[PDB]
Symmetry: D3
């Protein structure tokens, strides 16, 4: 009867995220990656692209599924019939804020949040920094799954 | 001859703020809650509303008064004839930044800043997160004074 | 096929620990509380006492069991046929060190470590501080399970 | 009816401590410096010396007095008829631990703890580091009051 | 064969920055201050002004030169024939983010980043806070070089 | 005219230390690894062993030399005719304390301290944790140079 949700904007998903997905998948019967929507623009890839990149990057995880999140994460979590959120912590993570949200979430919906440190090698990657560097000409291909690099290379060019 | 100022945007005031007001009120002869103004919009409640919510939430503190702050906090503080600022520290607080401002304030006006940890139970509440959650349908009534919940419920609906 | 280990010296177990036990128990099929041994003395309660206090404080958690840990936590974890460690994070937690150990543990045994924030109300309790305060005459009964208070009161007197 | 206690081992008192004493003295009607005792040795100066150094370094603060602390700080505080503790925060301060103690102290005795950042120039001085450096031949005279340097020079030699 | 780059927006340069420039200049044969450009506006001083203020504030550092940075800092660094970046760390510094960028930069270009703590006295100054305070009427002249105060006074008025 | 000192107990030296040595060696004309002495015991390897392990692990760094440190690091630094200390920062590093020492060192001897983040892969290794794990049977060979593993294996057995 176990399951966990991994929420995020995944714009785009990185190998740090995938590492977290793999570890959650190894510890819970079912994992749902919840891709949060963007009110307008300001994001790099649209929802369909984000979903595709995540699905394409998680074919080796049979007990994991991708779905679009709407509203409060806790509402999505309880709609999935779960009470756990799994989030990775890495270099640049505003972990103080993650703590605030975790307790707020416990308070309003009884939902637990389990944190896990990302692998050392993916500790400095973030969707935001990967995009910034990629935009300015830097090669971040070793920090992103190939389905993402493929699309990232195409966006540019 | 003692007094302290508790500055903030209080949009809206939370029970974490009230806890700080109560503790400052117990240690200083006079406490002044300074509500900072907003250059345009982007805030949820207007100044009059913010003032009302604070006053209505502090009727049990006779040595406390609410006033609108303008310009540098230190200028307001010295205008009140005081040299102390009391700020609460809680989960999500950018305490590194609070330290920078405290020393900058000491440097330019000789004004001291005393920090106090918020009660554990109100440690994850912030005006910003309360609004975000409230906006998306979450019930944060147990973290805000009733004068605020009353108005928050009315804003929605 | 899920299980997690909650390692510690639990000298004595606090309500913060119990909160963590409850949350791990709600998310994993099986939870094992691993009480680490002490090379000589310097601890307040002996192993038998620690075990008893934990068992007596966890009767409401059927899928949880208490066992004595020996050697590396990861060796104990794999001996239990698991690959997950669940640890609570609270005020005073040397979380930077917990991160170091988590990654070291992942590196040497492939064991994952999931962290969870303790409830706000139990955020300032630690076995060490509870003992220090208790020793000097302070009443920490509201932060410890009754099976522990009973024994703590008896130790003194 | 206001007063605050500044607890510590003050072995020896530094200019960072004096800065805190001065600021507490400017904001509270009465300030009491509570010098905590040492169970045996391991300290550099004995109680009488510590008291003397503090008194000699605070002659310019008429509303401040030095007394020897025994037991829990909160018990000392309430014995002084106060409910406030003032502590300075500086480089090397285990502020996470100070937060734990502040809340524990609030919990057991209703005593408030107000923190203040030390002046930038005294931010890296601590009794411990001053002694370590002094022991190995370093000159830390600019970070300690003269009554302390006088005694420190005499200890050596 | 040694050299280091000190990148930043320097809008405007502060005495904290100058302290870092001086220390880098004392340890490396050649130092290049790289002033990053601003995509549109939102900055206070234009590029020419920023360059002038830095040059005027560094006449005592013969082995230092000012140049305008474009694109990734690492690309600028390697274009200067160097592999080191020197950045100061101070109160308000998002050092967690600096760590992320340092490792990202090492990863993509093999460029090292050396951090140095700013002098205690300039630990609370930042271009942003200096401007904010200056804008509201505060005197921050003791935290900025005279070439900057001259221009800052003229901007206002 | 450039040089830097890398001080430490190196008991034993790890690959994280070597990474720092390599980076310092690439940026300074001369690097001196200063092995600090131990007042009595409590250390695992004796001075001669520590020196040997460091020398054997740094044969690829021609501009680096190993020497035994005595007294204050700053005194050793100035005796080497240098004014720079290079230290690595990693997971578990008490960086708040490193900041205190850096400023104390600047204050008493004018010596600068440059910090560098360790490579992500060696971010969780420390001499202390490597020994603790090694002692209890864990294999930390991938985090230590072979000259150290050779000796570590021999110590045990």
């Amino acid at each position: 009867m176990t399951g966990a949700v991994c929420p995020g904007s995944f714009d785009p998903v990185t190998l740090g995220h995938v590492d977290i997905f793999e570890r959650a998948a190894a510890q819970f019967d079912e994992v749902v990656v919840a891709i949060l929507v963007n009110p307008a623009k300001t994001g790099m890839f649209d929802l369909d692209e984000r979903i595709a990149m995540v699905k394409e990057s998680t074919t080796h995880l049979p007990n994991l599924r991708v779905q679009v999140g709407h509203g409060l994460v806790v509402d999505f979590v309880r709609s999935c019939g779960m009470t756990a959120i799994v989030k990775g912590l890495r270099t640049g993570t505003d972990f103080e804020y993650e703590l605030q949200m975790a307790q707020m979430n416990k308070h309003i919906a009884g939902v637990d949040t389990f944190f896990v440190a990302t692998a050392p090698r993916y500790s400095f990657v973030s969707s935001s920094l990967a995009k910034e560097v990629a935009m300015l000409g830097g090669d971040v291909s070793e920090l992103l799954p190939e389905p993402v690099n493929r699309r990232l290379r195409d966006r540019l060019n």
